[PDB]
Amino acid sequence: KSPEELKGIFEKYAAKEGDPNQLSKEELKLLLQTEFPSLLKGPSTLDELFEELDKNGDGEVSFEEFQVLVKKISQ
Ligand SMILES: [Ca+2]
Ligand SMILES: [Ca+2]
Protein backbone atom coordinates (compact mmCIF):
# COMPACT_ATOMS: atom_id res chain seq x y z
CA LYS A 1 0.00 0.00 0.00
CA SER A 2 0.81 3.67 -0.25
CA PRO A 3 2.71 5.50 2.41
CA GLU A 4 -0.44 7.40 3.41
CA GLU A 5 -2.27 4.08 3.89
CA LEU A 6 0.51 2.73 6.13
CA LYS A 7 0.34 5.88 8.25
CA GLY A 8 -3.37 5.10 8.50
CA ILE A 9 -2.75 1.56 9.85
CA PHE A 10 0.12 2.75 12.05
CA GLU A 11 -2.34 5.33 13.46
CA LYS A 12 -5.28 3.11 14.43
CA TYR A 13 -2.90 1.16 16.66
CA ALA A 14 -0.58 3.81 18.16
CA ALA A 15 -3.66 5.42 19.68
CA LYS A 16 -5.10 2.39 21.57
CA GLU A 17 -3.05 3.41 24.64
CA GLY A 18 -0.28 5.64 26.09
CA ASP A 19 1.11 8.14 23.54
CA PRO A 20 -1.63 8.09 20.83
CA ASN A 21 1.15 8.81 18.36
CA GLN A 22 3.57 5.99 19.13
CA LEU A 23 3.57 2.25 19.46
CA SER A 24 3.92 0.42 22.75
CA LYS A 25 5.27 -3.17 22.52
CA GLU A 26 1.58 -4.32 22.86
CA GLU A 27 0.22 -2.13 20.11
CA LEU A 28 3.06 -3.18 17.78
CA LYS A 29 2.20 -6.80 18.57
CA LEU A 30 -1.47 -6.11 17.91
CA LEU A 31 -0.67 -4.35 14.67
CA LEU A 32 1.65 -7.05 13.46
CA GLN A 33 -0.52 -10.03 14.12
CA THR A 34 -3.74 -8.50 12.67
CA GLU A 35 -2.19 -6.70 9.68
CA PHE A 36 1.21 -8.33 9.03
CA PRO A 37 1.40 -11.86 10.49
CA SER A 38 4.73 -13.08 9.01
CA LEU A 39 6.72 -10.05 10.12
CA LEU A 40 6.41 -11.34 13.63
CA LYS A 41 6.86 -15.02 12.76
CA GLY A 42 10.40 -14.69 11.35
CA PRO A 43 13.85 -14.93 13.00
CA SER A 44 13.23 -12.13 15.47
CA THR A 45 10.90 -12.32 18.48
CA LEU A 46 8.48 -9.43 19.00
CA ASP A 47 10.66 -8.31 21.87
CA GLU A 48 13.71 -8.32 19.59
CA LEU A 49 11.84 -6.48 16.82
CA PHE A 50 10.86 -3.93 19.46
CA GLU A 51 14.49 -3.29 20.47
CA GLU A 52 15.57 -2.89 16.87
CA LEU A 53 12.76 -0.48 16.21
CA ASP A 54 13.06 1.62 19.42
CA LYS A 55 16.12 3.73 18.38
CA ASN A 56 15.97 6.17 21.27
CA GLY A 57 14.81 3.72 23.98
CA ASP A 58 11.88 5.82 25.11
CA GLY A 59 9.67 2.69 25.03
CA GLU A 60 7.77 3.86 21.96
CA VAL A 61 8.02 3.37 18.24
CA SER A 62 7.10 6.55 16.34
CA PHE A 63 6.10 6.51 12.65
CA GLU A 64 9.63 7.42 11.56
CA GLU A 65 11.06 4.47 13.58
CA PHE A 66 8.39 2.26 12.02
CA GLN A 67 9.78 3.09 8.55
CA VAL A 68 12.51 0.37 8.90
CA LEU A 69 9.92 -2.53 8.78
CA VAL A 70 8.00 -0.93 5.93
CA LYS A 71 10.57 -2.42 3.53
CA LYS A 72 9.55 -5.90 4.66
CA ILE A 73 5.87 -4.86 4.69
CA SER A 74 6.07 -3.52 1.13
CA GLN A 75 8.11 -6.59 0.22
CA1 LIG B 1 0.49 4.11 21.81
CA1 LIG C 1 11.45 5.44 20.20
**Ligand 2 center from residue 28 Cα (angstroms):** 12
Nearest CA-CA partner of 47 in 28, 33, 66: 28
Which ligand gives the minimal distance to the CA of 21?
Answer: 1
Final resolution, Å:
2.3
Residues 7 and 62: their CA atoms lie apart, in Å, by 11
β-bridge partners, 23 = 61
- Structurally, the chain folds into a number of domains equal to 1
Q: Are 35 and 73 in contact (CB under 8 A)?
A: no
**By what technique were these coordinates determined?**
X-ray
CATH of the domain at 12: 1.10.238.10
DSSP designation for 75: -
The stretches of 1-75 forming alpha helices (DSSP H) are 3-14, 25-35, 46-53, 63-74
End-to-end CA distance of the chain: 10
**Ligand 1 center from residue 28 Cα (angstroms):** 9
